[PDB]
Design a protein around this motif. Sequence first.
Motif, PDB file in Angstrom:
ATOM      1  N   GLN A 164       0.789  -0.972   0.026  1.00 58.39           N
ATOM      2  CA  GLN A 164      -0.096  -0.022   0.359  1.00 58.39           C
ATOM      3  C   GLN A 164       1.144   1.379  -0.231  1.00 58.39           C
ATOM      4  OE1 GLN A 164      -0.117  -3.013   2.274  1.00 58.39           O
ATOM      5  NE2 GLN A 164      -2.555  -3.596   1.336  1.00 58.39           N
ATOM      6  N   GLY A 165       2.294   1.475   0.705  1.00 61.73           N
ATOM      7  CA  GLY A 165       2.691   2.084   0.702  1.00 61.73           C
ATOM      8  C   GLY A 165       4.257   2.547  -0.641  1.00 61.73           C
ATOM      9  N   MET A 166       3.270   1.719  -1.625  1.00 64.82           N
ATOM     10  CA  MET A 166       4.437   2.194  -2.867  1.00 64.82           C
ATOM     11  C   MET A 166       3.920   2.588  -4.064  1.00 64.82           C
ATOM     12  SD  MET A 166       5.960  -1.857  -2.830  1.00 64.82           S
ATOM     13  CE  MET A 166       6.846  -2.306  -1.340  1.00 64.82           C
ATOM     14  N   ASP A 167       4.049   2.670  -5.191  1.00 65.78           N
ATOM     15  CA  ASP A 167       3.894   3.982  -6.495  1.00 65.78           C
ATOM     16  C   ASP A 167       3.432   3.074  -7.592  1.00 65.78           C
ATOM     17  OD1 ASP A 167       4.005   5.189  -9.021  1.00 65.78           O
ATOM     18  OD2 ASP A 167       3.050   6.833  -7.927  1.00 65.78           O
ATOM     19  N   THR A 168       2.385   2.941  -7.464  1.00 68.31           N
ATOM     20  CA  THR A 168       1.394   1.594  -8.516  1.00 68.31           C
ATOM     21  C   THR A 168       0.572   2.708  -9.926  1.00 68.31           C
ATOM     22  OG1 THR A 168      -0.767   2.954  -7.432  1.00 68.31           O
ATOM     23  CG2 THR A 168      -0.271   0.244  -6.565  1.00 68.31           C
ATOM     24  N   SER A 169       1.223   3.752 -10.335  1.00 67.69           N
ATOM     25  CA  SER A 169       1.278   4.006 -11.541  1.00 67.69           C
ATOM     26  C   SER A 169       1.631   3.255 -12.638  1.00 67.69           C
ATOM     27  CB  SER A 169       1.799   5.824 -11.581  1.00 67.69           C
ATOM     28  OG  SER A 169       3.546   5.162 -11.384  1.00 67.69           O
ATOM     29  N   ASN A 170       3.309   2.227 -12.773  1.00 66.32           N
ATOM     30  CA  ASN A 170       3.608   2.019 -13.130  1.00 66.32           C
ATOM     31  C   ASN A 170       4.130   0.494 -12.334  1.00 66.32           C
ATOM     32  OD1 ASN A 170       5.642   0.426 -14.587  1.00 66.32           O
ATOM     33  ND2 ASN A 170       5.704   2.965 -16.218  1.00 66.32           N
ATOM     34  N   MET A 171       3.435  -0.395 -13.173  1.00 63.94           N
ATOM     35  CA  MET A 171       3.482  -1.670 -12.516  1.00 63.94           C
ATOM     36  C   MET A 171       4.497  -2.176 -12.521  1.00 63.94           C
ATOM     37  SD  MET A 171       0.120  -3.348 -14.624  1.00 63.94           S
ATOM     38  CE  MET A 171      -0.714  -3.534 -12.886  1.00 63.94           C
ATOM     39  N   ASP A 172       5.190  -2.722 -13.511  1.00 66.04           N
ATOM     40  CA  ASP A 172       7.101  -2.316 -13.347  1.00 66.04           C
ATOM     41  C   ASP A 172       7.263  -2.031 -12.255  1.00 66.04           C
ATOM     42  OD1 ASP A 172       6.105  -4.346 -15.588  1.00 66.04           O
ATOM     43  OD2 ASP A 172       6.725  -2.368 -17.374  1.00 66.04           O
ATOM     44  N   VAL A 173       7.339  -1.068 -11.883  1.00 64.03           N
ATOM     45  CA  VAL A 173       8.315  -0.200 -11.458  1.00 64.03           C
ATOM     46  C   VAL A 173       7.932  -0.306  -9.710  1.00 64.03           C
ATOM     47  CG1 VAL A 173       8.779   2.319 -10.460  1.00 64.03           C
ATOM     48  CG2 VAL A 173       8.601   1.751 -12.706  1.00 64.03           C
TER      49      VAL A 173
END
Length: 188
Positions: A164-173
Amino acid sequence: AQYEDGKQYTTLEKPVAGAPQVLEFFSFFCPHCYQFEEVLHISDNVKKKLPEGVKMTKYHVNFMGGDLGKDLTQAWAVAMALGVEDKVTVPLFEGVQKTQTIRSASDIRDVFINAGIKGEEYDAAWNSFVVKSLVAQQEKAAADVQLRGVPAMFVNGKYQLNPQGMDTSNMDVFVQQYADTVKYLSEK
């Protein structure tokens, strides 16, 4: 820091001694787990960044899907005992969450048959005591960490991943950040 308690992970107030190094929990009824497996391939990307000699363990849980949920914990035990995890994970996910063709232990069994496990071989494992202790290990491990949600990953019984505390804009990222976090925690 870059990696903070409460940020990319949390720390178990009651740490679990003698735990698997890297321990994952999922349910075949769990939608994010479906994503974690079919789209993100998390388990795989984590293993690919883990150090030498770290073992990866994945267990099923009972608290989703009622009677079918426990059946799935037993059949996942079969998968582990036969070493056919990689052949049944996807058809089990899609049978439960996509096609709705799994409604009974028997339908679960069909997935193994179509994947080439022999009828005798499957029924034998299903009823075997090796599989019962595999079911117990899965249950005990979840009990050990007060588990009440999936997907969930634990490292050395002390650190729990916090997607939940990670960015989900870019999946590979997202994935790389997840895997990298596990590696970091692994070395901690």
